[PDB]
Amino acid sequence: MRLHPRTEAAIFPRMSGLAQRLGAVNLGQGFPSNPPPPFLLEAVRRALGRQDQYAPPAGLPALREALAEEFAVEPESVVVTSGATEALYVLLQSLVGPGDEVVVLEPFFDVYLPDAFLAGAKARLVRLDLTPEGFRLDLSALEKALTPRTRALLLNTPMNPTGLVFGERELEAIARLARAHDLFLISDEVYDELYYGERPRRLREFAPERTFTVGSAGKRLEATGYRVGWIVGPKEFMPRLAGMRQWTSFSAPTPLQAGVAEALKLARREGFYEALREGYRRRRDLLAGGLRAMGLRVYVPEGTYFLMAELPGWDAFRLVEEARVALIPASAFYLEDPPKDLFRFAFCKTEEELHLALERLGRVV
């Protein structure tokens, strides 16, 4: 007896385990070290005992409605998934298969390749250029990766781990290419409210007929363990997506969907997103400023709570052991030939924790 070979798809947890043993500050964890806002907790608390049974696979009506309002679409174009993780899994399962190719940009988020593989498709990687000015997408490189077998392109903006936010010029180009080649566009926008400059434009604004936008309540409201996410896309494809997620987990947690629906409305009216953005901006500048003071190259992020910097001559292991600071090496985001001495820092930690990390790194340089 043996498991099917597709289970071959089954460093992040390992780095955290090593950090706990050595008592190192963990800047590798990709989630907040604080609780969610009080208005969310109260909304959930209020739903408990009133909405505890199965919600429709497509999602609680109140949540679909609340999301439709924000995206300026009809409720039927919204499907609630068990986290953006499920949204991405179901999207690949529904869009590609054996004989199909999907374009993924490198550095990538960890679920992209596994999801493509589990769907039976082939992932073609297009690497962003690391220029003196920072990360940049080369449109000619993207264009040359397209083949008659390509059916979809997966984009992540604001981007994890680079912190890159694609501008209107690049979004328009991607839209034209998708139209010319009749491709589906999957946009992982879980960090859509975490940006530091001008309000970014969305890919769906340029190619609404073929773009699926993914979001996460966990990444918007500092509640990653709630497992409530969504897909916003063309109405004609949504019923089938709802049908597919029905088999994977049936429906997202009902009381959590209920609380999130209410929290999304209040967050907007109470200016919670602006306060969140400023709180992270302060921490971004604290960390970036501290690293540059040490003479290190830091690629200041336009979004997300991640930042990448170069630490010449270091490897993640020696760092956590000597400096007592855990970081994630660039190798975790590249398939092969990762940039040298590049590391991802997560600044969704307390300022005290960040100051501690800088002091420790400073000692060992």
| Number of neighbouring beta carbons within 10 Å of residue 291 | 21
44 binds, among a second copy, ligand PLP, none (CB under 5 to 8 A by kind): a second copy
- Nearest-angstrom CA–CA distance, 18 and 328: 12
15 in contact with ligand PLP (CB under 6 A): no
User: Cα(156)–Cα(190) distance, rounded to whole angstroms?
Assistant: 8
Instruction: Determine phi and psi for 213, rounding to 5 degrees.
Output: -100, 130
- Identify the residue among 71, 75, 114, 130 touching a second copy (CB under 8 A): 114
**Which 8-state DSSP code applies to residue 298?**
E
Cis peptide before 107 (omega within 30 of 0): yes
Q: What's the CA gap between 223 and 178, in Å, rounded?
A: 34
Token reading at 78: 């919204």
Q: Are 196 and 303 in contact (CB under 8 A)?
A: yes
Q: Where are the beta strands (DSSP E) in 44-194?
A: 78-81, 101-106, 122-127, 129-131, 134-136, 150-156, 184-188
Residue 160 touching ligand PLP (CB under 6 A): yes
The binder of 61, among a second copy, ligand PLP, none, by C-beta within 5 to 8 A per type, is none
- CA 235, distance to chain mean position in Å, is 24
Give the other-Cβ count within 10 Å of 50's Cβ: 9
195 to 224: interface string for ligand PLP, x by CB under 6 A: ---------------------x-xx----x
Which of ligand PLP, a second copy, none does 301 bind, CB closer than 5 to 8 A by kind? none
Of 37-45, 158-166, 274-282, 313-321, which segment contacts a second copy by CB under 8 A?
37-45
Distance CA 13, CA 332 (A): 12
**Binding residue for a second copy, selected from 75, 167, 208, 243, defined by CB under 8 A:** 243
What is the contact mask toward ligand PLP in residues 73 to 92, using x (rule: CB under 6 A)? ----------xxx-------
Binding residues for pyridoxal 5'-phosphate: 54, 84-85, 109, 160, 191, 216, 227
Binders in 310-329 for a second copy, by CB under 8 A = none
Give the footprint of a second copy on this chain (CB under 8 A): 1, 3-7, 9-10, 13, 31-32, 35-36, 41, 44-45, 48-56, 82-83, 85-86, 89, 93-97, 100, 111, 114-115, 118-119, 182-184, 210, 222-227, 237, 239-244, 246-256
The residues that touch ligand PLP, with contacts defined as CB under 6 A, are 83-85, 109, 156, 160, 188, 190, 216, 218-219, 224, 229, 250
